[PDB]
């Protein structure tokens, strides 16, 4: 079965910056385009960044330019995302969810990881 | 971006009833080359957001006869014929026609007073 493992959410004060990580299994990771998804305790679902599976950002909200970075390790099978100068609205539950050819979307979402920006 | 209006935002049902919601485009999912690529997402309650349908009527792995997607240009239904308890939850509609990928502000599936 395909799996998808986030970690790395937490406490992170204003300003901080956080570093997530998304473990995959049960497919062939490298084959794949990954993306990051946040859900925001209003349950309003946003694309964070996206990836191809050569480890290019293919996307990016033109808000967070500058303060993100969507990253792989294919042989880790691991998908990264940094996010710094945290603001109050980067509290979320953030996913990561694999892009599928056919459906030209999303297939498969992890667990998420949740990030509490505080003061 | 394109936004995606859903219809209604709550829906209390019983189990059985046969249910529609919707999802409506702000712009036209067939102005280009990647016509009504109009998606449907299941978040149940405390778990991760499931794909149902895709690109309109196409059943994901695993979802059941009991669903089933209409619609083109801007105006996109779901259905479900006979609503189970593992239906309950948060239905999203997400659209990857235009740049960027964008997600509808959801219809809540839940059980009636
Ligand atoms: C997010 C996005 C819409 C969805 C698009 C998508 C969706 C699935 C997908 O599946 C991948 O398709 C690759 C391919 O086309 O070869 C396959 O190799 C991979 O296995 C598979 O993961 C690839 C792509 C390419 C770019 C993505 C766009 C970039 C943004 O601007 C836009 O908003
Ligand atoms: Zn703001
Ligand atoms: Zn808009
Ligand atoms: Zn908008």
């Known amino acids: 079965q395909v799996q998808l493992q986030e970690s790395g959410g937490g406490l992170v004060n204003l300003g901080g910056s956080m570093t997530l990580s998304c473990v995959a299994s049960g497919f062939t990771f490298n084959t794949y385009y990954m993306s990051w998804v946040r859900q925001t305790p209003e349950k309003t679902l946003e694309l964070v960044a996206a990836?191809?599976?050569?480890?290019?950002?293919?996307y990016y909200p033109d808000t967070l330019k500058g303060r993100v970075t969507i990253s792989r390790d294919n042989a880790k099978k691991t998908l990264y995302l940094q996010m710094s100068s945290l603001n109050f609205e980067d509290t979320a539950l953030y996913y990561c969810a694999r892009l599928n050819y056919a459906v030209y979307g999303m297939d498969y979402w992890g667990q998420g990881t949740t990030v509490t920006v505080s003061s | 971006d394109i936004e995606l209006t859903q219809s209604p935002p709550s829906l209390p049902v019983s189990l059985g009833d046969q249910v529609s919601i919707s999802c409506r485009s702000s712009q036209s999912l067939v102005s280009n080359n990647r016509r009504n690529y109009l998606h449907w997402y299941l978040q149940k309650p405390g778990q991760s957001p499931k794909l149902v349908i895709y690109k309109v009527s196409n059943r994901f792995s695993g979802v059941p006869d009991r669903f089933s997607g209409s619609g083109s240009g801007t105006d996109f239904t779901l259905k479900i014929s006979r609503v189970a308890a593992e239906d309950l939850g948060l239905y999203f509609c997400?659209?990857?026609?235009?740049?960027?990928?964008?997600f509808g502000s959801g219809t809540k599936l839940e059980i009636k007073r």
């Open positions: 997400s659209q990857s026609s235009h740049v960027p990928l964008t």
């Open positions: 990836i191809n599976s050569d480890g290019e950002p293919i």
